[PDB]
Design an enzyme around this catalytic site. Structure first.
Site: not given
Ligand SMILES: C1COCCOCCOCCOCCO1
Ligand SMILES: [Br-]
Ligand SMILES: [Br-]
Ligand SMILES: [Br-]
Ligand SMILES: [Br-]
Ligand code: NA
Lengths: 453, 453
Positions: B14, B118
């Site tokens: 990520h 996220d």
């Protein structure tokens, strides 16, 4: 712990009364219910509360907000969407209600309720409730069918791929084939694109997905396919808790007592529309020509010459307030002429009365498709032009009206429509009693609001 | 100057793409801040200072305290890669959810124009909203996976099967894609655990609740799912990838001696957790296959005796860091063995190298369907069991691996896969250059963030 739900309806009679009924259903499950209104609208709620507040009858609290009528240039005393007549006032009225945000944020900061149920017309209410980690529910006051139909029309724009005003297009994805024409959609969407109405509708529909979920004044068994389509295809979290009007459960009645079963046409449009003289005249001539017995509620140059005399005892005309529920539930009533607003459609379904559908504006042309093509408990009067102004050109003539009055009473399928209407009535009462789909969905909503963290 | 804050979860897959997105924003004169934790800061610092000095604009870091002790993790466990085993992953998510206090504090203080948070922070929407800041979701995966997860979650095709290996089609998709329960996480299909199922629900709901989704794909790669995601599933989205491409020795000399398309590159990442019995089977497969290979292994009981000797000509093992990009872009490389994580898949597409697909967990079995059945640039190793834990029982044997290595180099469709891979490479570079689909979509996103009111 006692749970607290705040109700924030728009100041229109058709949103306010069903919002009160939802508040009562929450109250009856030992939830504190507060409704936000304005001072010139307060009398409507306070009448119904004291009327309803007998033995049992748990308490409903009111909070009053100042509507900035003068701040946005509304003629003083215009605190109701019904007083916003003309192109000019409706746009000021919405800028009006949008400036209630400061007060709503203040009241939520102060009281920290467990949930806000806010009118479809307050899309910003989601952001406001979120500032205090309060879940916001949307309440529209219409059918699952209308909520789905508007949303597929908005997204797939099937009307840009026709060429003329009368060309039929299918609603995409729908589990029933539904044909509309541009005439049946508001002129902003299809003719001269006005950003204001188009943005307003966008933010209302986007709020259904942005918010915690939607409360729906319908019952699963009425439109099972649209209750599912709304949740699955269009991906909304929803509860069906209606018909909410069944929560707390005259001269013309004596008149009706003398008549045969299914022999009287009830005509009542509500305070939704302004009935213009030439329209009332054509209705009057249609009633005489049809031979049908009738109770006609009107909100004297517009009556034909001998009218009162020639119909004495086959017909009654009432000016103003009628005890609508009692008249529809009477055995003598065989049909109901209405504009297909959802509150009125629900009172037809609940009384088990087939309907002559006369759609004018808002979601009424979609409600007419639900009633005529899916539930099959109605007959169209032939009105097909969406309009919030009433022009002489759109007046429906005697012959069209008379054909519908005959068809709804003594047409081949009249008795079938009546039987289908009786089934939906039995299903409606069953939905709201203990173990019913709408009782259960309300229980599940309250539980989920308790558990929310 | 416009200011965007980037809040990725502490996972290398990520974090790296989030940095690349921050650089793309910086290159358009947007102030970019990334939120990380102190034990993860070194990852960002390395890439920044290596990439900087080249004049390219500055990216700011803000450090948050990860409450490792508060939820019972080791103080050293600040990364999803250290949360190994059933037990720790649950503590890690409780961990990251307690970052809310700090995020709200930082946004109150700095008032940026947008939060890119996220997928794993669904609460970040409400947190950004408290200060009237729009929140974008970033997943790090394909449009295909985003669509596939959501159709599987909503239409539950796996309730209608009876055994673990029974194939079901993904509904609504314009491709026939057949999966088995073994390929889905054990919570969703076997023993329903509230935790992982609620977590997935709130992640998917956040795609609609937030302002929109940034997607690390290019329109031309999966045009049908770029559309499905926006239309069928009603997400506001921008495709701005591959974000990897924004920027743009011993093994290379080795590779220079080899034929075009003659070498298999094997690299699972230093993310990946490889047990000794799995590595042994990979080693025996590489020998038996006869194919030339570069094999990168994470920083010796798992090597057969005399392995290094017997493959001295055909085969190179690298322990630790390999110059991955330069190796994949080299003419000698004809295949890439990888786990089908989207970062890895994108470096295959961008180098124009067909892939042996070895899905393990997360969205990787959906990515494997995209690569093998839709892009048709890969061959499955035959891993079909979703698992966060690596048990000896599930180890993929020499015979299965060896069959895939032969199939990716000299199988029926080998040359065609190579050609299709080279088209996607050409389209990927075209998408991110000026006038490209991904350059355009980034410009439109920035414009829309400027105009936000
Ligand atoms: C989720 C909610 O997406 C809202 C838009 O829906 C537009 C048309 O629906 C197509 C069916 O998709 C299935 C799931 O849908
Ligand atoms: Br239905
Ligand atoms: Br109709
Ligand atoms: Br595609
Ligand atoms: Br496959
Ligand atoms: Na959908």
């Amino acid at each position: 712990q006692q749970l607290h739900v705040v109700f924030f309806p728009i100041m229109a009679h058709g949103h306010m009364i069903p919002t009160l009924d939802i508040a009562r259903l929450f109250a009856a499950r030992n939830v504190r219910a507060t409704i936000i209104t304005t001072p010139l609208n307060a009398h409507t709620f306070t009448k119904a509360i004291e009327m309803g507040k007998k033995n049992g009858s748990p308490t409903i609290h009111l909070e009053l907000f100042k509507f900035p009528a003068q701040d946005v240039g509304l003629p003083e005393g215009c605190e109701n969407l019904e007083q916003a007549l003309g192109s000019s006032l409706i746009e000021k009225f919405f800028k009006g209600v949008g400036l209630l945000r400061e007060q709503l944020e203040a009241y939520l900061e102060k009281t920290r309720p467990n949930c806000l149920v806010a009118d479809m017309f307050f899309p910003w209410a989601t952001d406001s409730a979120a500032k205090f980690n309060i879940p916001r529910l949307v309440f529209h006051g219409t059918s699952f069918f209308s909520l789905c139909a508007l949303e597929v029309v908005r997204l797939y724009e099937p009307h840009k791929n026709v060429s003329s005003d009368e060309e039929l297009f299918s609603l995409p994805l729908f589990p029933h084939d539904i044909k509309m024409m541009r005439l049946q959609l508001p002129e902003d969407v299809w003719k001269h694109e006005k950003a204001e109405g188009k943005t307003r509708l966008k933010l209302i529909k986007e709020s259904e997905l942005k918010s915690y979920g939607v409360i729906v004044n319908s019952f699963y068994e009425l439109e099972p396919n649209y209750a599912e389509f709304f949740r699955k295809e269009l991906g909304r979290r929803a509860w069906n808790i209606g018909p909410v009007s069944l929560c707390n459960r005259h001269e013309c009645l004596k008149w009706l007592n003398s008549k045969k079963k299914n022999s009287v046409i009830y005509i009542c449009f509500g305070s939704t529309a302004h009935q213009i003289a030439p329209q009332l005249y054509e209705i009057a001539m249609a009633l005489e020509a049809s031979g049908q017995e009738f109770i006609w509620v009107v909100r004297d140059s517009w009556l034909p010459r001998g009218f009162e005399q020639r119909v004495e005892g086959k017909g009654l005309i009432i000016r103003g307030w009628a005890p609508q529920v009692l008249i529809l539930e009477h055995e003598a009533i065989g049909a109901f002429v209405t504009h297909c607003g959802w509150n009125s459609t629900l009172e037809g379904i609940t009384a088990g009365v087939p309907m002559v559908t006369w759609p004018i504006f808002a979601e009424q042309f979609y409600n007419e498709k639900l009633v005529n093509q899916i539930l099959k408990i109605g007959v169209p009067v032939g009105a097909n032009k969406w309009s919030r102004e009433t022009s002489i050109e759109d007046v429906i003539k005697k012959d069209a009206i008379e054909k519908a009055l005959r068809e709804i009473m003594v047409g081949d399928e009249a008795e079938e429509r009546r039987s289908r209407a009786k089934k939906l009535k039995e299903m409606a009462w069953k939905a709201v009693e203990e173990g019913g789909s709408s009782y259960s969905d309300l229980s599940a909503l309250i539980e989920e609001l308790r558990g929310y963290h």
